[PDB]
């Protein structure tokens, strides 16, 4: 007539701070470019969206 009470639950481990996977949604992309131009014999570098 003895009884045992067993209870348990699920928590996120502390390792969730370090080892985790981030599930994201993606939207339009902000394209950027780096370009080298031979301008009058000089190498110039530009960077623009």
């Amino acid at each position: 007539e003895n009884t045992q009470l067993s209870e348990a639950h699920v928590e996120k481990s502390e390792s969730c701070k370090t080892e985790f996977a981030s599930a994201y949604r993606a939207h339009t992309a902000s394209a950027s470019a780096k370009l080298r131009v031979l301008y009058q014999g000089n190498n110039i570098t530009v960077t623009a969206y």
Partner: protein, 48 residues
């Protein structure tokens, strides 16, 4: 359970945890004080 996303949270520091691991408690063996359970293993590890 057992797949990617069995446990979810909005941000790593958030305390809101959603878990669907199919955790069923089982009868302890005779003469023992252990707490047995049948739980689907971590879906994150299986994904890894």
């Amino acid at each position: 359970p057992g797949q990617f996303g069995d446990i979810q949270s909005r941000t790593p520091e958030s305390k809101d945890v959603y878990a669907n691991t199919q955790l069923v408690l089982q009868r302890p063996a005779a003469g023992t004080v252990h707490v047995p359970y049948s739980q689907a293993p971590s879906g994150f590890k299986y994904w890894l």
